[PDB]
Structure 1
Amino acid sequence: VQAVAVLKGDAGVSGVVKFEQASESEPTTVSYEIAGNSPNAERGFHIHEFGDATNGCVSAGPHFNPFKKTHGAPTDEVRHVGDMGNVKTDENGVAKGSFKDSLIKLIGPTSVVGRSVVIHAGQDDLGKGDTEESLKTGNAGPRPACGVIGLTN
């Protein structure tokens, strides 16, 4: 199964995030190309609950969290399903990369098809900050771009 999200916004950030998953129990491969970010930085990157684009990136809602866990790093076992950590940006503001994830799925009752991807303006502190906010959002800040995740082939 394949899916894709086209990230758009008004802040100069835009990109494309691709998903592929062979079967429900197998990892999903997530790959991304994102332009217009701050250079030489780390930027929070998550699946949010709703595929709702009626109000910018606000209407995407919170991090996708069906299991009611705190916010964490992708390699933490306690994390939101949608937590994809930080993406690294180069000297030109480009984030490009890929990873595998075993919580993110395109199949079954936690499928992210129809949800959203958000790229943030700040760094995700991976749930390790001082704040109650760290356990909710990682303090990753504003949502310069987002896109609904759709089926493709």
Structure 2
Amino acid sequence: VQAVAVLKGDAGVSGVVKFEQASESEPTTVSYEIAGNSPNAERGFHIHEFGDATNGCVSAGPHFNPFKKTHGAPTDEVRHVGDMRNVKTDENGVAKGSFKDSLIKLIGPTSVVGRSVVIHAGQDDLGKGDTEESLKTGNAGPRPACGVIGLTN
């Protein structure tokens, strides 16, 4: 199964996020290309609950968290399903890469198809900050761009 999200906004940040999953129990391969970010930085990158673009990136809602866990690092057992790694940006403000993930799926009751991907203006503290906010959003900050995840082939 394949899916894709086209990240757009008014802040100079834009990109394309691709998803691929063979079957429900297998990892989903997430690959991305994002331009217009701060250079030489780390930016929060997550799957948000709703594929609702009626209000900028606000209507995407909170991080997709069907299991009601706190915000964490991708390799933490306790994390939101939507918690992806911070994306590293080069000297030109470009983030490009790919990774495999076992909580993110394109198939089944927790499918992210119809949900949203959000790229943040700040670094995600992976739930390790000294605030209650760290356990909710990772203090990743504003949402310069986002895109609804649709089915493709």
TM-score w.r.t. length of structure 1: 1.00
2:34 and 2:73 map into 1 onto residues whose CA distance is: 20
Q: Which residue pairs with 2:3 in the alignment?
A: 3
Shift of 1:85: 2.3
* Distance in 2 of aligned mates of 1:70 and 1:147: 23
C-alpha distance after superposition, 1:47-102 (max 9, x if no partner):
00000000000000000000000000000010000000200000000000000000
Distance 2:143 2:27 in 1: 26
Shift of residue 44, structure 1, vs aligned partner: 0.1
Q: Which runs of 4+ in 1 moved over 3 A?
A: none
Name the TM-score, length of structure 2 as normaliser: 1.00
Deviations 1:16-54 (A, max 9, x none): 000000000000000000000000000000000000000
Measure, in 2, the Cα distance between the counterparts of 1:76 and 1:88: 19
Q: Which runs of 5+ in 1 are unaligned?
A: none
- SS of the residue aligned with 1:98? strand
Alpha-carbon distance in 1 for matches of 2:108, 2:11: 34
**Alpha-carbon distance in structure 2 between the residues aligned to 1:116 and 1:97:** 19
Q: CA RMSD in A?
A: 0.2
C-alpha distance in 1 between matches for 2:34 and 2:84: 14
The answer for unaligned runs of 5 or more in structure 2 is: none
Residues matched between the structures, number: 153
1:34 corresponds to which residue? 34
Is the counterpart of residue 107 in structure 1 residue 90 in structure 2? no
Query: Residue 84 of structure 1: SS of its match in structure 2?
Result: coil
